[PDB]
Amino acid sequence: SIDVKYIGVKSAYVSYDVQKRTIYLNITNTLNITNNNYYSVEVENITAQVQFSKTVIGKARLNNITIIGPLDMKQIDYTVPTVIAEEMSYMYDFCTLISIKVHNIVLMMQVTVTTTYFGHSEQISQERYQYVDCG
Amino acid sequence: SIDVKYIGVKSAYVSYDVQKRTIYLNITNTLNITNNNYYSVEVENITAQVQFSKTVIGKARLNNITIIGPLDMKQIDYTVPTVIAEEMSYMYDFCTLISIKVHNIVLMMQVTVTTTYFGHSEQISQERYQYVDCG
Amino acid sequence: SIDVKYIGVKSAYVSYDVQKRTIYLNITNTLNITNNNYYSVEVENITAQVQFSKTVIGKARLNNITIIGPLDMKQIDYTVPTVIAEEMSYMYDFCTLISIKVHNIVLMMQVTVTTTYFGHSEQISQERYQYVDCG
Ligand SMILES: *[C@@H]1O[C@H](CO)[C@@H](O)[C@H](O)[C@H]1NC(C)=O
Ligand SMILES: *[C@@H]1O[C@H](CO)[C@@H](O)[C@H](O)[C@H]1NC(C)=O
Ligand SMILES: *[C@@H]1O[C@H](CO)[C@@H](O)[C@H](O)[C@H]1NC(C)=O
Ligand SMILES: *[C@@H]1O[C@H](CO)[C@@H](O)[C@H](O)[C@H]1NC(C)=O
Ligand SMILES: *[C@@H]1O[C@H](CO)[C@@H](O)[C@H](O)[C@H]1NC(C)=O
Ligand SMILES: *[C@@H]1O[C@H](CO)[C@@H](O)[C@H](O)[C@H]1NC(C)=O
Ligand SMILES: *[C@@H]1O[C@H](CO)[C@@H](O)[C@H](O)[C@H]1NC(C)=O
Ligand SMILES: *[C@@H]1O[C@H](CO)[C@@H](O)[C@H](O)[C@H]1NC(C)=O
Ligand SMILES: *[C@@H]1O[C@H](CO)[C@@H](O)[C@H](O)[C@H]1NC(C)=O
Ligand SMILES: *[C@@H]1O[C@H](CO)[C@@H](O)[C@H](O)[C@H]1NC(C)=O
Ligand SMILES: *[C@@H]1O[C@H](CO)[C@@H](O)[C@H](O)[C@H]1NC(C)=O
Ligand SMILES: *[C@@H]1O[C@H](CO)[C@@H](O)[C@H](O)[C@H]1NC(C)=O
């Protein structure tokens, strides 16, 4: 939330990086570093806090009631045949793949019907995605 | 939220980077660094806070009621055949792929019907996406 | 939440990295480092806090009631045959794969119907994804 970074190869504060086939002969490197850091991140100062939720019923006549959740799946048909016919023939399959519904990252918070919150919520995702690499 | 960065290859504060086939002969590098940092990020100052939610019923007559969630899927048909017929023939498949519904990043917060919030919510996603690389 | 980083290869504070075939002959490296760090992360200061939830019924007549959860799956059919017919033929399959529903990361918090929160919730995911690599 404060210092989120994505670094590809190299990350450094003071780097005298050297690489292939070099001559580092008579250098006189000298440093003088002062790097004081002060974090006072999201400190609270609270006197009172109330989360109230009341449901009062009475003399109440209620018929059919349906409150369904935050994702319903109904009558979902996946209908993928795969028919191969081959008479006196030559076939060559490489990097052949058939994928159906598939997920890599699935993150859910506060997936309800009724919710009362107080706080600080984060979701951070850092990757190097590579699905198909055939060659 | 404050210092979000995406770095491709190299990230540094003071970098005397050297690369292929060089002559670093009589240099007299000298540094003098003062890098004081003060973070007071989202500090609160609160005397009172109330999250009130009331539902009062009474002498109330209610018929059919339906409150459905924040994503419904109904009668979704995926109908992808794949028929190959080959008589006395030559076939060559490489980097051949059939993909159906597929996700990589799925993040959800506060997916409800009724919600009362108080706070600080973030979603950060940093990647290097590469779906198909065949060659 | 404060210092989240994704580093590809190298991470360092002060790195005199050297690589292939080099001459590091008469250097006079010198350092002087002061790196005081002070973290006071999310310290609270609270006098009172109440999470109240009441449900009062009485003289109440209720018919059919259905409150279903935050994800229902109903009548989901996966119908993927795979028929191969081969008379007097040559077939070659390599890196051949058929995948059905599949997940790698599944994280859920506060997946309910009714929820009252107070606090600090995080989800962090860092990876190097590589699904198919055949070659
Ligand atoms: C630096 O090193 C070289 C070596 O080739 C030498 O000839 C030269 O006198 C040196 N000078 C100092 C100031 O160290
Ligand atoms: C290096 O930094 C310190 C920190 O204040 C300072 O007192 C000093 O004069 C600087 N130089 C040297 C040569 O030490
Ligand atoms: C608010 O400020 C600081 C905490 O950050 C503290 O010294 C002060 O007493 C707080 N005030 C109250 C009323 O709590
Ligand atoms: C709703 O309630 C009535 C009763 O008044 C009932 O006849 C009907 O079947 C209910 N609805 C469903 C979908 O069952
Ligand atoms: C720097 O190094 C070179 C080496 O080729 C030398 O001839 C020269 O006298 C040096 N000078 C100083 C100031 O160090
Ligand atoms: C380096 O920085 C410090 C910090 O204030 C300063 O006192 C000093 O004069 C600077 N120069 C040297 C040569 O130390
Ligand atoms: C608000 O300001 C600071 C906290 O940031 C604190 O010193 C002060 O007392 C706070 N005021 C009240 C009324 O809490
Ligand atoms: C709605 O309620 C009536 C009762 O008055 C019922 O006949 C009807 O079937 C209900 N609707 C559905 C879709 O069931
Ligand atoms: C540095 O090392 C070289 C070795 O080739 C030498 O000739 C030179 O006199 C040295 N100088 C110092 C200042 O150490
Ligand atoms: C190194 O840093 C310290 C820390 O303040 C300082 O007292 C000193 O003068 C600096 N230089 C040397 C040569 O020690
Ligand atoms: C709030 O500020 C600090 C804690 O961060 C503490 O010294 C002070 O007494 C706190 N105030 C109250 C009323 O608790
Ligand atoms: C709803 O309740 C009525 C009674 O009044 C009943 O006849 C009906 O079958 C119920 N609904 C379902 C779907 O069973």
Author numbering:
A (entry chain A), B (entry chain C), C (entry chain B): 120 to 254
The publication says:
pmcIn neurodegenerative diseases and aging, the microtubule-associated protein tau (MAPT) and the transmembrane lysosomal protein 106B (TMEM106B) become misfolded in different cell types and give rise to intracellular inclusions. TMEM106B aggregates, as discovered using cryo-EM, are composed of amyloid filaments that originate from the carboxy terminus of TMEM106B. The TMEM106B protofilament core spans residues 120–254 and consists of 17 β-strands. We also determined that TMEM106B amyloid filaments were identical in the gray and white matter.
Neuropathologic, biochemical, genetic, and cryo-EM methods were used to study the gray and white matter from the frontal lobes of two individuals affected by multiple system tauopathy with presenile dementia (MSTD). Filaments were made of one or two protofilaments. When a filament was made by two protofilaments, these were identical. Densities corresponding to four asparagine (N) glycosylation sites (N145, N151, N164, and N183) were observed. By whole exome sequencing, it was determined that case #1 was heterozygous for a polymorphism at codon 134 (S134N) of TMEM106B. The encoded residue is inside the protofilament core; however, by cryo-EM, it was not possible to establish whether filaments contained serine or asparagine at position 134 of the core, due to the similarities in the electrodensity of the two residues.
